[PDB]
């Protein structure tokens, strides 16, 4: 079987509001822009 006998790593049930509002920062161009998708939109813009 793949189901381990021993569980020493508790997993919490996800809080709905926290994990739903986490979704907003993947495409946000705000404070965490450098760690999320908008940082790789461009391929070296020139102006």
């Amino acid at each position: 079987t793949l189901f381990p006998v021993l569980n020493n790593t508790p997993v919490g049930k996800q809080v709905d509001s926290i994990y739903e509002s986490r979704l907003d920062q993947f495409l946000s161009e705000g404070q965490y822009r450098d760690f999320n998708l908008p940082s790789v939109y461009d391929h070296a813009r020139i102006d």
Binding site: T1, L2, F3, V5, L6, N7, P10, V11, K13
Partner: protein, 1082 residues
């Protein structure tokens, strides 16, 4: 019509009923009636039959009119508002009747042409007994039932198909959201069906069905609906019939309910090829096999066809709070052995949808007994906190985990309406982790399972999902184990599921810890007696050449014991007749266990004391796996004798010397003092313990200054119980707000002698209710034989809706209390902070409740009680309830309640555990039968090492002649010990599982005369060791060892891999009746 209405014409058919009435309230079998009794009295529609629980047999002779040569289906309709069970002429059960919910019996196309007869075994009780006004009210013994239908029918099959179509569409109209377009599509189609149907034109039925096809699709008429979109199902439907082995009816009626449910389900399986049915309890299979062997043969063929899936793996669907740990292991051992013997199946899902609470070590016992899945729905009855998740990992005290699912539609008796199918996915509580719900449909809580109407509705729900696609994709042809396989596959072997660590607390039915006190006391006594009997039987079979281990007698005793642990009998929520059955068979188990133990003892060279031999040669049997250095026991009616043992632990001999630390009872300024070397107990003339002073640590233990209790410990309080709905099941949190303190007692000194000092309190509970409390202190030689201040209450209990409890304020400050539960400790809060803690106002414990701070603690030991409450320096033991609703005389009568207050100068440790075991022990007076065979072999199996490791059980293996030793860590730390096997030649010692299948081989040393296998246990581990005597990331699903070499993977399922050694052993049984194993390398 009767045949008397048709004499001139041999063409218009009839129905003739001859009724035979069983004289007593007995339940004769088919062969004891048909062919022997006379069916003479004639019955007709409108007749009335029998008092409650009465049995009537009907010979039904039918003549179909020849104009019914057409009408490809002919129905016999039977509606007497009670139980059915059509019998064929050859005695074959064919079809059950249950009031109006199940009335039709399809004539089997073989005796429609021939004017044939059959039989109906009517039982004069409802699906849930009689009731007397309410379902759970005490049975009405004078109920009478009226026959309202005994008709032959030739149903219009297209009309009934249209009725099912319209019912599903109308439910979609009523249930779907008001902005859902499928709701209005359904309403539009239903309206056209009405505008189209004319009762005078039968082709309108067919065009109405064609109209409904726009909503249900074209495949609803067969099992082809489920073959579409069958790869992304969200709801998995499985048929189920929960038959309470005894809830509101005797065991004898359960025997008939089993057969009439399963024969019905088997004929339904014949008609519906996609339909699958799970039933759990192995004892019910055994009962069917005893009563109807041919039905059992047919049943095992169905099990082979993967219809009729046996599940659960336990003897009965038992309570998990009250029985001790060995009882839970025995439930699994007996159930799994029965299922492996009768079928080729080993259950992998623990099925327990109706049990009141789940103890913290159930996942570990499940993993030890081969089950890694858990199904339950009872936690939906939590009336304070909704359980956070529907699918989760349930982790035991030791860390062992099962994967648990709670069917989101909070029932195991669903109806397959669109609301049930919808709720099976949309009230799933943790849908972000998995989007699969189990739909458990049928009629249960004691009775007969799903009807063909429910399968038609399921087919139409699937068709709606296929066609207009708002209902969930429902799958019907999958087993429960395949459902769990899907969950494990989607969740990375369950790694992403939320965890629950410890006990699953049921915030309901708490009164079940205390109600039926006699049965619970008998259960504990019987468990301890069975342990002792198996221990001495193992010793006698090992050391006596002419004694065979009584496997058959022990198996019978365990079957009865495990039967009485059923999740409604043991918690104390049955009608009075159930206990008029259960208490005597429990007493018989106790008596026969004692007889077995005495046979083994006689084989070992001893005999009962017989009260004629002189005291100096009296011995005492210990059976605890450690030296109880001294025991004080009565020999005559009032003579106390001290038995000591210096080295050998099994046998204690009567002592000559006086005690080093005698106990004394004297008087003071109207106060009574019970004094020891260790404790000073100051008892008011009221009977309240004014002071409990530890003499070594010169500290007071009581703290009467803070808290609500200012007048003494051991305070008896009578609370007004009056729960909200279920009197025998429930106690409410508001029950503590209204009470009477029993403080009118009088104290007298019963004894003051050196062995045991003791006062007697005579407490008037009320008129009709009295109690005599004895408070005793024992002297000792060593502090390890002390059990604290002992209390023996003799209660004449005749109260109504009262709850007698006893309180001890204890000068301990801690945020948690430790309660001994099966194979370990559960920690419960003492503070009521959140609603989770508010829900735990009364909790279940096995033999002690400990309340300790860093420097001191107080344990309350008991020998018959299971309800406790520790909240803010107040420890309260629940003593007696007086419910009335299922049983009007539940606990009325005499009760002996023993409990001890054991103060100790540290946090909880092994001294409390040993004191609780000793407090619960039955030390038996023995006499050497001779002096040539009086050897003390009672130390053959010892456990030496950390005292928190308990050798809890010694047994002989079911299969061979090996000895099974159950060992467990009791206090929660990784510990080291050694099994010492002294007077024996040990071929080998292996670590095995709960089913006694070898897991690994252990290194056994060889000392001067013993063997000394060193063992290491994890924090709360339950280990099993098989001693064979004589001279001689994929893990295997039998031995839970990582498979490094080639493995064997079962293709029939998803998560069963066996190693090469276990494959050669043929140890690969699992929920696959016909397993196919492919070899896997590397």
């Amino acid at each position: 019509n009767p045949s008397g209405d048709v004499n001139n014409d041999l063409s218009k058919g009839f129905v003739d009923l001859k009724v035979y009435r069983v004289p007593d309230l007995s339940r004769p079998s088919f062969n004891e009636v048909v062919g022997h009794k006379k069916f003479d009295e004639t019955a007709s529609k409108g007749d009335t039959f029998g008092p409650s629980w009465a049995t009537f047999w009907f010979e039904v002779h039918i003549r179909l009119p020849k104009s019914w040569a057409k009408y490809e289906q002919v129905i016999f309709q039977w509606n007497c508002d009670n139980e059915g069970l059509v019998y064929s002429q050859d005695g074959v059960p064919l079809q059950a009747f249950s009031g109006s919910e199940r009335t039709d019996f399809i004539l089997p196309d073989s005796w429609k042409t021939t004017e044939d007869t059959f039989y109906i075994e009517m039982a004069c009780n409802g699906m849930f007994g009689t009731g007397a006004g309410s379902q759970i009210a005490p049975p009405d013994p004078n109920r009478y039932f009226t026959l309202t239908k005994a008709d032959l029918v030739a149903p219009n099959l297209p009309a009934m198909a249209l009725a099912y179509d319209f019912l599903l569409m109308q439910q979609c109209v009523k249930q779907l959201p008001s902005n859902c377009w499928q709701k209005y599509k359904a309403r539009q189609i239903c309206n056209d069906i009405m505008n189209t149907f004319h009762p005078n034109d039968l082709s309108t039925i067919n065009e109405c069905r064609n109209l409904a096809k726009a909503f249900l699709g074209n495949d609803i008429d067969s099992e082809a609906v489920f073959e579409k979109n069958n790869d992304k199902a969200n709801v998995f439907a499985i048929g189920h019939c929960h038959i309470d082995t005894a809830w509101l009816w005797p065991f004898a009626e359960t025997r008939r309910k089993i057969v009439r449910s399963w024969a019905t389900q088997m004929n339904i399986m014949d008609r519906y090829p996609e339909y699958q049915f799970v039933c759990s309890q192995a004892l019910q299979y055994l009962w069917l096999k005893e009563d109807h062997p041919d039905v059992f043969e047919k049943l095992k063929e169905y099990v082979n066809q993967n219809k009729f899936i046996p599940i659960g793996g336990s003897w009965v669907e038992h309570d998990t709070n009250i029985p001790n740990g060995e009882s839970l292991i025995r439930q699994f051992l007996l159930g799994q052995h029965f299922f492996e013997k009768e079928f080729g199946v080993r259950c992998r899902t623990f099925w327990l949808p109706d049990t009141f609470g789940y103890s913290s070590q159930i996942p570990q016992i499940c993993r030890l007994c081969g089950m890694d899945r858990f199904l339950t729905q009872k936690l939906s009855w939590n009336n304070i906190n909704s359980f956070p998740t529907s699918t989760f990992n349930w982790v035991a005290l030791d860390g062992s985990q099962v994967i648990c699912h709670m069917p989101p539609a909070n029932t195991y008796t669903a109806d397959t309406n669109v609301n049930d199918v919808l709720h099976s996915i949309d009230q799933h509580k943790n849908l972000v982790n998995d989007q699969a719900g189990l739909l458990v449909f049928g009629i249960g809580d004691g009775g007969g399972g799903p009807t063909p109407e429910m399968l038609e509705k399921l087919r139409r729900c699937k068709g709606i999902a296929n066609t207009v696609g708002y209902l969930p994709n429902v799958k019907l042809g999958n087993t429960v184990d395949e459902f769990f396989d899907g969950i494990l596959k989607r969740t990375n072997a369950g790694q992403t599921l939320p965890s629950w660590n410890g006990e699953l607390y049921f915030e309901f039915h708490r009164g079940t810890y205390t109600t039926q006190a006699e049965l619970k006391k008998l259960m504990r006594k019987v468990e301890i007696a069975l342990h002792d009997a198996e221990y001495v039987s193992t010793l006698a079979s090992i050391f006596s050449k002419d004694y065979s281990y009584p496997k058959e007698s022990l198996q019978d005793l365990w079957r009865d014991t495990l039967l009485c642990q059923f999740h409604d009998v043991l918690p104390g929520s049955c009608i009075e007749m159930v206990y008029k059955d259960a208490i005597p068979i429990m007493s018989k188990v106790l008596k026969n266990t004692e007889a077995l133990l005495w046979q083994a003892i006689e084989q070992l060279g001893f005999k009962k004391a017989s009260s004629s031999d002189n005291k100096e040669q009296l011995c005492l049997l210990n059976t605890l796996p450690w030296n109880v250095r001294g025991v004080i026991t009565e020999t005559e009616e009032n003579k106390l004798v001290y038995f000591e043992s210096c080295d050998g632990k099994g046998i204690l001999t009567a002592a000559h010397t006086s005690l080093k630390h005698p106990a004394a009872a004297y008087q003071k300024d109207d106060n009574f003092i019970l004094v020891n070397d260790h404790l000073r107990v100051t008892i008011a003339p009221n009977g309240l313990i004014l002071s409990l002073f530890d003499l070594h640590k010169e500290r007071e233990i009581l703290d009467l200054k803070s808290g609500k209790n200012h007048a003494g410990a051991n305070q008896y309080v009578l609370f007004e119980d009056t729960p909200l709905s279920w009197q025998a099941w429930d106690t409410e949190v508001f029950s503590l707000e209204k009470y009477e303190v029993l403080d009118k007692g009088k104290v007298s000194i019963k004894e003051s002698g050196p062995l045991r000092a003791s006062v007697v309190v005579d407490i008037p509970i009320s008129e009709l209710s009295h109690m005599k409390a004895t408070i005793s202190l024992e002297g000792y030689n060593d502090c390890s034989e002390f059990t604290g201040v002992n209390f023996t209450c003799e209660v004449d209990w005749h109260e109504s809706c009262k709850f007698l409890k006893v309180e001890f304020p204890v000068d301990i400050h801690s945020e948690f209390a430790s309660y001994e539960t099966q194979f370990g400790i559960t920690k419960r809060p003492t503070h009521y902070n959140t609603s989770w803690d508010v829900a735990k106002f009364e909790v279940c414990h096995q033999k002690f409740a400990d309340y300790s701070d860093f420097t001191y603690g107080v344990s309350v030991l008991n020998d018959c009680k299971y309800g406790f409450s520790t909240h803010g320096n107040l420890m309260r033991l629940s003593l007696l309830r007086s419910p009335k609703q299922p049983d009007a005389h539940a606990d009325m009568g005499k009760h002996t309640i023993r409990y001890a207050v054991y103060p100790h100068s540290k946090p909880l440790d092994s001294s409390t555990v040993r004191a609780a075991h000793k407090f619960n022990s039955n030390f038996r007076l023995l006499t050497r039968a001779s002096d040539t065979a009086n050897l003390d072999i009672f130390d053959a199996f010892q456990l030496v090492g950390e005292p928190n490791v308990i050798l809890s059980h010694i047994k002989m293996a079911e299969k061979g002649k090996s000895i099974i030793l159950r060992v467990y860590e009791s206090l929660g730390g990784k510990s080291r010990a050694r099994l010492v096997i002294k007077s024996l030649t040990v071929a080998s010692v292996t670590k095995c599982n709960g089913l006694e299948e070898d897991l690994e081989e252990l290194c056994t040393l060889k000392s001067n005369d013993y063997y000394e296998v060193p063992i290491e246990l994890r924090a709360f581990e339950i280990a099993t060791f098989k001693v064979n005597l004589g001279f001689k990331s994929v893990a295997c699903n039998t031995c839970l060892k990582i498979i490094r070499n080639d493995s064997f993977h079962c293709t029939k399922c998803f998560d069963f891999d066996v190693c090469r050694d276990c494959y050669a052993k043929q140890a690969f049984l699992h929920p696959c009746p016909k397993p196919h194993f492919v070899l896997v390398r590397s």
